[model samples]
Target: ATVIVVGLGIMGSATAWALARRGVRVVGLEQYAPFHALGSSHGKTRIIREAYFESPEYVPLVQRAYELWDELGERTGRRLLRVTGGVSIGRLDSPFIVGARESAQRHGLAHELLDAQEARKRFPVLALPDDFVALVEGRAGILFAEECWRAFCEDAVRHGAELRFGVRVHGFAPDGEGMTVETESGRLRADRVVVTAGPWSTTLLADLGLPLEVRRVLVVHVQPDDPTRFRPEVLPIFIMDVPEGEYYGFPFLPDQGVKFGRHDDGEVCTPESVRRTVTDDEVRWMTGVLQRYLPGAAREVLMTVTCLYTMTPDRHFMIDRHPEWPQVVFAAGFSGHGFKFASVMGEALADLALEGASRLPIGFLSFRRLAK
Candidate 1:
């Protein structure tokens, strides 16, 4: 059957690859150029942690994602995932540490619970608060986001999928037993369609009236006084629940410096109206987090960029068939934590579009929870 995958970011790219590998006819459409940074998937590094603080349901999804990322890396002969471990830091009773520990214990994943002094001893780069603690998980690491997306897109093409970039999809609707995709250029027919439009999902699926909010996020990279102190071996990825908000950071990379950002409370805006500029005050605010938690890494500003987060009200993902159009399947409202699951979500989307069900356990992320 002919299938059309819309918005070829990480989700759509993986969907196209999954469908194409099945030897079916697949077509992918992207409104922007290949590997463009206008959307949520352009970052050089995205955290991949198995001990999900958000929910334990994500643990299984992320486990499968690790496997798929490995498979994709093997196929493309590239290192897609880098193991740096990860730590969730917050007060002893903070949900961040509690949730990570809950998922770890529930999933039987290898982990360690460290007190403030022990955490600082193990990772000297961090100066944890006296009341804070850390949940260290060994399986957590990083995903080369853009590289992974490109691997999916290029491999999908290699597997007989046709990808069209810079083609904006106006809309899509059911035409008899099939689907009609209306684009800026022309129209096309498909037996099924998968919409992974990221921020644009709000506009494309307006009929569903999905409670999805798009927010602008600023990513700040800073040069450390001693880069060796922040290397992967010395420092691991960290997610801290501080009073300011939920903050996260990565180990120092050669060119990208030490990357970090606020995971919560981004300014709400649409993709078209979102601000791309990163001001000095914004940089100072973001860097201040490091001053308190990771002081040594707060030297000079290396770079900054804006990424979008398509958030569901509950911050859980929405992956389901259209209640009105079973021939159309979509995944959105990732709520800033979805990229790590893109691999598994892609497989799940393909299953929903083709077989109407997925073997993977994603019932918790269904739209029924938020539906009126």
Candidate 2:
């Protein structure tokens, strides 16, 4: 009944929390301190929408994720979600908008498709081309990223899961009988092992060598001159297909202001070798995107932060057991869009560790395609 969960980020935290709730002795390990900004889960806000543009297959996963997120909030009694609605804007033929429309239609989710004129009329701040369109998901909003990590950690402790911080997992192996987890502190044996490490997964997972590229994505927080206009109530989380690229952003949340980041064109780096500093020249492209689409929010540069993206070959997530070891489970290759699925992702990994299969539709994300 003893299970070991590595990388106490959003997914690992949730996995530890989930396993502990199921009456398993859980040992969670984190390389950095709780809610640290080194990994993908440190950002202030992460967008969560039901009408998944990536694929309709993700619709069910995200749907259950939404329910679990609600339950997580209720269990901890925190303001975890904000419903400002959201829009995915791109060309009519672009995969972003087209996929959103297809998924919304397939799932029968409440959504509105608007052309450029209609989108501009509703969200005047968003600038788009005449050919571009927007699919608005009424339930789309932000998940307080830092708050989520903290909530999960608190609840995991409450559920009797032991969390070790500032400890790195050097390597791991299965000894026929059980899994042996190696760490900076020492080694421990567990009936099961789950690796949810963000960028570091590439280094720790030897067998898969995980076709994961750790991308250093850029995000900048701009202080708008008019805070009232950027209020969460008025402004919705938006992803727009700008001429530069597909960029997404969140409304101002008091102290955090407006956070925006471009989806593509991230620099590749390792978990340990990532450049932790942000420069004015480096974030110039992001600022240009803000000026063009959200002109008012570009008034002042508040702050900039860097996070890692554990990208797979297809830019999808992998939630399955290790190809070689059935007792060892792992979830990685989240790319950049996996945070919203943390709640359900944790549950799926826990189910996999305990029951060898998850009820969630994660078949498409298995390791057969990636395993050599």
Candidate 3:
């Protein structure tokens, strides 16, 4: 059976690869060029952590994703994930710490619980508050965001999937038990369709009235005062539940410096109208946070950019079939934390479209949760 996948970003590329590898006829479409920076997945790096604080339900999915990432890497001969490890710092009752620890304990994942002093001793770069605790997970690292996307798209093509870029999809029409994809060029009939449109998910599936909100996010890279002190060996990927908000960052990479961003409270916006320019005030605010939390990594701004976060009301995700059209499946509203799950979610999407269901514990992400 033929399957049409839309918006070839992280999720889209992964979906394409999964379907093509399974010997399913797949057609992939992208509105922009391959691996374009206009969407949410263009940032140079994305953190992959197993002690998921968002929800314990995510732990299993991420574990499966870890395996898929390795398999994909072996196939492409590229080191897509770097095991830098990760740490979550917050108060004993803070959601960041409590949730992460809960997930780790519940799933029996290897982890370490440390006080502020112990954490500081382990990661000297952090200037955490005296009242805060830290949860360190060993199986955490960085995903070369764009590289993974390229690998997936290339592997999909190698496996005989046809990918079309710079082609806008008009809409979809249901045929007798199948679907018709209307694009700028022509129409293609497919037995099933999957939409991983990222921020444009709502626009593409407007008829569904998906409760997705687009938020404009600021991403900054800074020149650390001592690059050696912020390297992966010295500093782990970190998320701190500070009073200002949840600030997260990666270790210093030569290509991107110390990439950092706040996890919550981005301004509401649309993909087309969101401000692309990163203001000086925004830079100052980010650097100021770095100065307080990671003094060694606070320095001149190397580069800055704006990214989009498609959020759901509950800030989870919607990864299920279209209510009325069982032949159509879509994944959307990743909030700000979905890239790491791209590999496994793609597998789930393929299973849903082909077998009418997925074994993955993605039931919490079903559209039925928000249908009421």
Candidate 4:
């Protein structure tokens, strides 16, 4: 059967690749070029750790993602993930640490529980308050975001998928026995379609009356005044929950320096009118957080960026076949932490398209939950 994948971001590229690898004729469409700054997946690196605090149900799914990522790396000759370990720091009763620990235990995964002083002893670069606890999962690290997306597209093309870049999809409608995807250029027919549009999900699915919204997220890259202190290998991916907000980041990777951001607060933005500009005020605020928590590494601000996160009301992902249209599936509303699972999610979406079902436990991602 012929398949049309909309939006060439991480999710869309992955879906196209998966379908093509399964011997399905696939057409990938992108409004912008690959690795463009308009989408959420353009960041250089994304955290890919297994200490999932969102839900225990995600442990198995992410475990599959970890394996698929490794396999993809070997297949594409690109190092997509770096396993530097990860730390979730907060009060013993806090959601961050408690949720991570619970998920680990539920999945029988290996992890280390470090008290405040013990955590500091293990990672001297980090300063943990006495009230905080740390759960270290050795299998966690960072995922190469843009590189991975590019690699997926490359592999998909090699597997016989056609890609159309800079093709803005104005709208779509159901044609006889198939769907017609309308672009700025013309309309193309497809036996099936998957809408993995990131921030523009609402806009694309508005005519269908789907529930979705786009959230603005800001990330700041800071360079240490003394570069000698911070390096990628020595530093582990960290998540710190303070009274102010939730923060996370990766270590210095060559010239990229250290990247960190507050995950809790951001302006709500529409896809068409998203403010792409980064201001000095945002940099100053990010630097302030750095100074307060990681005083030694907080230095000159090198760069800053703003991205969009398509969010559901409950901050979970939406992956299911459209109730009205069996041939049309959607995998959107990832919130923000969806990049790491793009590979496995691609496989699942392909399975859903080909077999009308997936073996993965994506019941949590079903649209029925939102209807209630």
Candidate 5:
């Protein structure tokens, strides 16, 4: 059967690769050029870790995703993933540390719990209160975002998937047992279609009555005063839960400096109407957080850019078929934290599209749980 994959950002590109691996006739359409700055997947790096605080059900998905990253690295001869380690910093009972610790323990993952004093001693860059703590996951690291997208596309092409860039999908409708995907270019008839549209997902899948929102946020890359001390070799990617909100950052890279992103703090914006420019006020607030939490490394803002986050009510992912149209499946509401699972989710989308069920444990992400 033929398949049409929409919005080839990260998830769509990987899904195309999965469909190609299954030897299905795949036609993948991307509205923007691969790795373009228009969406969430264009950022240079994304965090990949095992101690998932979102849910314990994600532990196995992350485990399989790591394996796929390894496989992608070997198959493409590109080191897309790094082993920099990571930490969840918060109060003793905060969501960041508490949830991550529970998931680690429940899943039998090794972790190091450090009190504020111990955290300060181990990672001098952090400046948390005495009541705060950190759960360090040694397996956490960074994933090169652009390179990963390219790897998926190239591998998909090698396996005979036709990926067409700069093609906008307007909508789709069922045609007999198959479906017809309507795009700006033309129409594509296929038995199955996977919609991986990032910011534009809700616009396309609005009829499914899924409540999703897209928010505009900034990613600031700044230079730490002591770059050597913040190097990946010694420093780890960190997620800090503060009274302000949830803040996460990466260590210093050779060419890419350090990246800092705040979660659930951006304003609502339509996908097409989002203001791309970062105002000076936003920059000040961004660096202010840096100074307050990580005073040592907060010096100069090297660069800053904006991206979109598609959020669900519970901050979990939606990987299920259209409630009415089984021929159409969607991966939506990634909540700015779904990049690491692209590989495994791609496989699951393929399984869902072709066989109507996935071997992976994605039932929790289905509409049955989401509709409630």
Candidate 6:
């Protein structure tokens, strides 16, 4: 069977790789080169945690993703993941801490609950309030973002998948038994198609009358003056809920220094019109957050990056078959936390393309459920 995949971000690249591995003839389209900073999957590292705060259903999926990530490593010969562990610190009743604790307990996963003093003792970089608590999960860590995407695309191409870079898809039309994809270059016919566009999902699907929202996300990279104390080996991936806002970051990685970002505020921008430049205020706000919680490590700013998040109203992923077309399947609205599951998501999309449905619990990701 012939399959066409659009967008080459982590999700699309991983999906194409999975499909090509299944011995299917696949052609992947990307508007930008691999590892382009325009999309959500750039940065040096992305956090991968089992204790999901969004929902417990994701715990199982993340578990499966962890296994797949290992397999991907073995296949690619690149260390894509780092097991630095992760901490969720906040009030006991706060959604972040409570949700993580609930997921851990429900899944019977190994975790530790620590008070302010205990948390401070373990991770000295963070300064938490007396009322704040921490839930630490052993398996949580960080994923190398660009490397993982490049790995998937390389593997997919090596497995006989054709990839077209700098090709923008204008639209598509489904015939009785096949699909005619229209792109900037030309048209191609495929038995099935998977639209995994990140921020452009709404516009591409809008021609087919699908509703989706695109949101912007900001991330900052700062260099600490005292690099010895903020080194990656000494520090683990951490998430803190301070008076400023909700912030997350990885340990210091030499040249990259300490990478941190806040998820609370961002302007909604169109994918094509997204502001690629980072503002001074954005950097200042993020540096202030670091200074408050991680006083020792917060130092001179090095650089910053911005990306887009395609979000559903609930901030959950939307994965399903096209309402009017059976041969067309789509996965979008990942918000910002979807990178960790790129491999599993690609596997699910591949399953749906090859078989009729996937075994994973995608009920929450259905577009039909949004209507109800």
How do the predictions measure up, each by TM-score? 0.98, 0.97, 0.98, 0.97, 0.97, 0.97
Q: Give the root-mean-square deviation of each candidate in angstroms.
A: 0.9, 1.4, 1.0, 1.3, 1.2, 1.4
Model 2 agreement with the true structure over 1-80: per-residue lDDT tens digits = 99999999899999998998888899998888878878888877899988888889999999898898898899998878
The model with the greater TM-score, 5 or 6, is 5
Model 1 over residues 201-274: C-alpha lDDT tens digits? 97988888888899999889999889998999989888999998999999999889999999899899998899
User: How many backbone clashes can be found in candidate 1?
Assistant: 0
The C-alpha stretches of model 3 lying farther than 4 A from their native spots are none
Between 1 and 5, whose lDDT is larger? Answer: 1
**Which ranges in model 1 have alpha carbons more than 4 Å from their true place?**
none
Candidate lDDT (C-alpha), each: 0.91, 0.86, 0.91, 0.85, 0.88, 0.85
How many clashes does each candidate structure show, in the order listed?
0, 0, 0, 0, 0, 0
* lDDT minimum window of 10 residues, candidate 6: 207-216
Local accuracy of candidate 5 as per-residue lDDT tens digits, 254-285: 76788888886699988889999899998888
lDDT (tens digit, per residue) of candidate 6 on 1-372? 999998888888999999998989999998887688887788778999998888999998998999989988888888899898888888888788888888888999888989999999988878888899988888888898777888898888888999998999998888877899998888989999999988888778886555556667777777777787876666778887666777788888876778888776578788778888878887877888788788866667777878777777787898998887888888888877899999999999998887869999877788776784
**lDDT at 108, model 5:** 94
Model 1: residue 346 alpha-carbon error in angstroms: 0.9
Q: Which 10 consecutive positions of candidate 1 have the poorest summed lDDT?
A: 363-372
Clashing residue pairs in candidate 5 are: none
Q: On a 0 to 100 scale, what is the lDDT of residue 338 in model 2?
A: 94
lDDT (Cα, tens digit) per residue for candidate 3, span 1-372: 899999998999999999999999999999999888899999778999998888999999999999999999999987799998899989989998888888999999899989999998998889989999989999999999888988898888999999999999989979996999999999888999999999998788999899989999887888887899899998889898898888899999997899999878988999989998888788899889888998967667888988899999999989998888999999999998999999999899999989989989999999777766
The lDDT of model 2 is: 0.86
Off by over 4 Å in 4: none
Clashing pairs in 3: none
